[PDB]
Structures are given as C-alpha cells and as structure tokens.
C-alpha cells in the first residue's frame, strides 16, 4: 500500500529528536502505553483473532492525516481497536460508550490482499536481483524506494514465514517463504541525492526476480 507510512526517502523533515546517549526516560511515559502491545499479543496469542501482520496493515489503514498527527503508541491503540471491531469481537458503540466520546478507527481495507506468489526463485548469496516492478494496494513489506531497483543478496534466511501480502489480510494462502537481505548501493536508490553508502532491505522471496 503506497500510504503515507512509507516514509523512507521523504524530504522536508527536521532533526531527529535525540542526541546520542541522551535520557529517553522510562519505557512507558504514560500509564496506558503498555496496553497497545499487550492487547495486540492477547489478540494474536490468546484469542487467535489476528496476526501481527494484520496489526501493521490496520495501522497503515489509518486515514493519512490521522496517521500523521497521531503518536506511535496511540496508532496501535487505534489499530488494535479497529481489528477487534472488524473481527466482530467488539463494537465501536461499546468502545465509544466506555471511552466517553469519539473513537475513530482505521479505514476499511480496499484490497482483499494477494496469495503467496506461485512462481519464485531460490536465490544464492552474491546473486544480483531486481525488486519486482509491482504495485500492491494491500499490505506489502517492500518500501517503495526499492521497487524496480537492483541489488545483491547478502543473506538468505534459514527460516521461512507467511507472505505478508496474504497473512496481513487474514488469508488462508500465505504459504511460507524465506527472506533475503538485499544490498543496494545508495546511488541505486537515490541517485546523487544521498550521503550514504549502502542500504540493506529484508525482502520476501516473492518480491524478487533475477536481475
């Protein structure tokens, strides 16, 4: 999904709000902040209501201006609540009644997702690959900066996982794929407009093709 959450390479932001080894304060800065992650795990591990991929996607589905003005932990409160409503576990009415006011949720999905790709290649370390020139309206774990770009395999994972574009929509056809650490030259991604060296993206097999 080409949403505003795909921030890598966006220009116009100011300084990162940190200097090295500065005090970051406690793990949680408010008494509610442990709830989003804890309730995510309740949903995933205890209820079996959704996957972690579905949580990433529901946050991507926040209305774009809403996403951009919402603190991190609050995005997950909104995301988890949205999934609970979508899965029929909770109603928005009861959330708003308990909250004592408005509790707007993420927007409905506009894609049913897609299956794990039928035809893929097992790549080897050192091989040149290109990120498939594909557009996916639902969940995908490919940041747009690498779409259609060429890099070299530095690692093939020894484990395999469900294809995000499927599991992120709760589909039954996510299969399993390894992922690949694909190293791109900075200039491949940003031309002359970068001060970096290389960028390594961890890409599912189904996002790749031989160069």
């Amino acid at each position: 999904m080409d949403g505003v959450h795909d921030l890598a390479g966006v220009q116009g932001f100011g300084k990162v709000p940190h200097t090295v080894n500065a005090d970051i304060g406690p793990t949680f800065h408010a008494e509610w902040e442990h709830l989003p992650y804890s309730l995510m795990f309740a949903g995933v591990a205890e209820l079996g209501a959704f996957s972690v991929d579905e949580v990433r996607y529901v946050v991507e589905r926040m209305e774009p201006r809403h996403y951009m003005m919402t603190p991190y932990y609050e995005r997950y409160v909104i995301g988890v609540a949205t999934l609970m409503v979508e899965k029929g576990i909770l109603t928005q009415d009861e959330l708003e009644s308990l909250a004592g006011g408005p509790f707007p949720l993420s927007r409905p999905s506009e894609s049913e997702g897609r299956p794990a790709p039928v035809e893929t290649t097992t790549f080897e370390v050192g091989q040149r690959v290109r990120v498939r020139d594909e557009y996916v309206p639902g969940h995908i774990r490919m940041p747009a900066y690498c779409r259609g770009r060429v890099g070299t395999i530095s690692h093939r994972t020894t484990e395999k996982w469900p294809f995000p574009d499927a599991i992120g929509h709760g589909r039954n056809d996510a299969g399993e794929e390894p992922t690949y650490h694909v190293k791109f030259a900075a200039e491949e991604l940003f031309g002359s407009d970068t001060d970096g060296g290389s960028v390594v993206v961890d890409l599912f097999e189904g996002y790749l093709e031989p160069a």
Binding site: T27, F28, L35, L98, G101, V199
Partner: protein, 197 residues
Amino acid sequence: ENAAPAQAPVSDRAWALFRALDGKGLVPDGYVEGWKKTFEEDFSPRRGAELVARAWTDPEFRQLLLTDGTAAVAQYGYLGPQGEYIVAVEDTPTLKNVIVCSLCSCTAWPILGLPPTWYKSFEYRARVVREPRKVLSEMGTEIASDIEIRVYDTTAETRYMVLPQRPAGTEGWSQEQLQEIVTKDCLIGVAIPQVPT
C-alpha cells in the same frame, strides 16, 4: 479542511479498549500487567551489551554471533518476541552499520529493549535511509567520508543488532567494564562506544 477528527482523550480510549475486552473474559488475569513487567524489566539493551562484551573478548563467540545470531543469543536465553531470528552486523574500520524500521518501529526487543520515541519518529524513519551521515552527525556521531555507512531497514522478520568496533584504551578490561560502555544507541548503530578521558 485537513482538521483533526474529534477524539476522546487517548488514555480514555486505551482503557476503554482494555475494559471492553476484559469485561468479556478475553484477557487472562494479570495478562497486561505481566507484559508491562516483561517490557520494562526483561527486554533490555543491557542484554545486547553483554553479548557485545562477550564477542569482544571471545573470538569463538564473536564468530558464532556473526554467522548464527539466533544460536548465540539463545545461549544466553535472550530470544523472545520480536527477537526470534537475530542477525548481528559487524562494524569495521571501513564500515559503519545503522538500523531502522522505515515502515513502523521493528526492533530486536529482547536484546535492545523496546524502541525509543526518537527511533519511531517520522524524522528518523524518513531520513536515516537517505542521509545517514548527516543524521548521525546531527545526533552527535561523526562518521568520516571514507567509512561506508550501511543502513539495515527492518522490513521483515530479521531482527538486528550492531556489533560496534572495540575502542582503543579498553585493552584488558573485564566483560563488566566493557558492557558499561555499550549503550542502547551503540546497538542501534547511531553511537560509537565511548571510553572516559
């Protein structure tokens, strides 16, 4: 036009979500409280620091950590949620590694701790992939022009830690002394371990 939607206070919304689920018997006794304790006390960069200090003083462990991070971390019992498949990346005299999750906040929780607010910032997520030298400089870390900066974007299930270079002036230090100078920011890759004057 472009206005924020009406919303109840975030604390009220977050607790409403808890109460709605808890009131239906869907949250086990002490469940969120247990996670809070895990997040605050167990998931910690002190663990990553222990791993780095060991790698610095044990060539055999260093090689295991760099080839099978998961197995190395498992020896200490530090595998966990968001830290099940670990890859450690080695800084060298010509290579500086830095970690980000540009798409959200993905972090090796059990060994780095939960990500700090700044790591989740739109500024870091947008900028470090494209201008890591300037970002690090602004944060207080100068990387010379000849050192290649390599940014790892945490886009799938691999969870990363940086193994920084061991600084001069630490020869013969104990593992405890070495651990002390490996900070959370060293493990993320935005800082270099510092030796007191």
